[PDB]
Amino acid sequence: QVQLVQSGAEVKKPGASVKVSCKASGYTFTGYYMHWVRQAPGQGLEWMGWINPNSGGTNYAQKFQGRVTMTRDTSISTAYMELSRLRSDDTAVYYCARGGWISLYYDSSGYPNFDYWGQGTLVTVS
């Protein structure tokens, strides 16, 4: 079935960076969008933009302005996030979630349908 396998938890120094990845399985990941969200233990859910698997174009949400980059590799169906310039405010739980179907004929990225999510990962800053 549709699974999303994430990496393990990690803790880094202030100003450092951490790489987060999510692996697709059970479906053709090249036909669906992929979004990310962060949630601190007691706060809401902050949304980060999608990454297209085919052309590799990326969108980023506000309040990042480049402190987070997104890349992919289609040979193993895996996405990677590089989270740079860590601060204590970045202590949170991260998840990947699969988005909607990509149709090549209209913009569908704005359909917040997330039916399959990874197990998530913990990111802590000391």
């Binding site: 297209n52 590799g56 969108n59």
Partner: peptide
């Protein structure tokens, strides 16, 4: 180029 990718 565009903010989300490129155009041909």
């Amino acid at each position: 180029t565009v903010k989300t990718g490129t155009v041909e």
